[model samples]
Target: NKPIVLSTWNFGLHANVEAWKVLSKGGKALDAVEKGVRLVEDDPTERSVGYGGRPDRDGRVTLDACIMDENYNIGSVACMEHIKNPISVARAVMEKTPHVMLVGDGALEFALSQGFKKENLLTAESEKEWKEWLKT
Candidate 1:
């Protein structure tokens, strides 16, 4: 039997292609999943994940991400700021640490310790919209 791939929204169509590439070559589901999501995460134009994601009511863009292996091991991080790839961090947590979840400043601290770099996650396009919401 062959493996099937799917992603969450209309934009996920693009993510699916990457996942499919992994599966068609007999890659593991976990590899496909991370590879797929990373596309959307790295895309500045996506406006909902990783780089260039939207901000909260306080105008800070905090990212959240999770990764689970086929064996059911899960790792997640919440309210992470200034990181470009939270998905990678989540996977690190799953594989490297004993914890399943890390949040806020703790998440950032772990990410940095694991060699993840800090970066501005907000884009002008997203910020402009957040400002507009302030007026509404």
Candidate 2:
């Protein structure tokens, strides 16, 4: 008898072969992973992610990203800055010389050096909501 195959939710930054294409095209695993993660990060529909999103205890929009290669080499950033894109920096840590995580201005500096640009995060309604939340 054949095994039962059930449909399952395929969630996360990468959908499928998209990430693989970057790697197969000679791009590093970290780069591929970043590209995949960026999909989710930039998805406005994914409200849980950064950009036009929520903040934690410190009232800051911190981001988190992680990437692991087939060979187990990995890089990560927990509670990163509000630069819109963090997965790219995580990958840079793995592919670049020797770094993993950069916080505050350090992260911002590195991102700027790498040509990262920032985007607006808060909107009039978001500001109202965030301010309302603060009152609680």
Candidate 3:
């Protein structure tokens, strides 16, 4: 009852695998969610949620992520760029600020201000896919 993991999409399998690593040790649900989502975000093979995710038409990798506790508090970031792990920043926004959402460059700036490192999310394979799309 204490260590249940819930997630969306097929990649939820990957997320739950990471979450189980924490939940089995009696970690809080929030911590499990954070770790779970972070694992999805780090996956290069998955291209819908985090690193190696699809880009906007302009070929920039923009990501959106959020975290919420059962008590209903949530923090979110959308259209964020250059940050591989936006979920961590989303957690920071929830814990450190009164805001619920930050977008675009604001999200990037806030992430940097919180000491989150920026990293390229685009993989060579994904970039090649984008290039091919541009050609069409």
Candidate 4:
């Protein structure tokens, strides 16, 4: 017997298209997940996740990414800074280390050592929204 079936909305299907496309192209499962998750992360209009996301009291953009291979080796980076692509760092961690996580300045430095390009996450819209939110 099977459990109750479930489904998702049009947006979910749209998202799955990209994920599936990546997998179909021989990308790893984690790569597909990152591809799907990045759909949300890269959206500048979002209020959650990635740049323009709601920040803490100090107004800094934080990013987190996790990847697990079929062999159960998992790697993650959280509360990262400076670099925009946290997924790359996560992949590096999985491939480079026997460990699981990295965070903050250390993560940024490691990413830089690996030659990741740096970019300011503080977009004009995000800055405006953050400043306005401070008024409340």
Point to the candidate with the largest TM-score. 1
Estimate, for each residue in 1-136, the C-alpha lDDT of model 4 and write its tens digit. Answer: 3111111444456557667777777777767776766666666665566655666668788888887777988889998976767876888988887768999888888889888878777778877778998998
Error of 1 at 2 (Å): 1.9
Query: Model 4 TM-score?
Result: 0.80
Better of 1 and 2 by TM-score: 1
Give the runs in model 4 whose Cα sits over 4 Å from its true position: 1-13
TM-score each candidate.
0.95, 0.69, 0.93, 0.80
Q: Write the per-residue lDDT of candidate 2 for residues 34-133, one digit (tens) a residue.
A: 5665666776555566665566654566777766776866666666665787777766666773776666667767767777786655545556667788
Model 2, backbone clash pairs (residues 3+ apart or across chains), number: 0
Candidate 1: global Cα-lDDT? Answer: 0.92
In every candidate, how many clashes are there? 0, 0, 0, 0
Candidate 1 clashing pairs?
none
TM-score of candidate 2 relative to the true fold:
0.69
lDDT winner = 1
Q: Worst lDDT window (10 residues) for model 1?
A: 1-10
Task: Estimate the TM-score for candidate 3.
Answer: 0.93
Q: List the residue pairs that clash in candidate 3.
A: none
Q: What are the per-residue Cα lDDT tens digits for candidate 1 across 25-121?
A: 9999998999999999999999889897989998999999999887899999999999888888999999999999999999999999999998998
3 against 4, candidate with superior lDDT: 3
TM-score of 1: 0.95
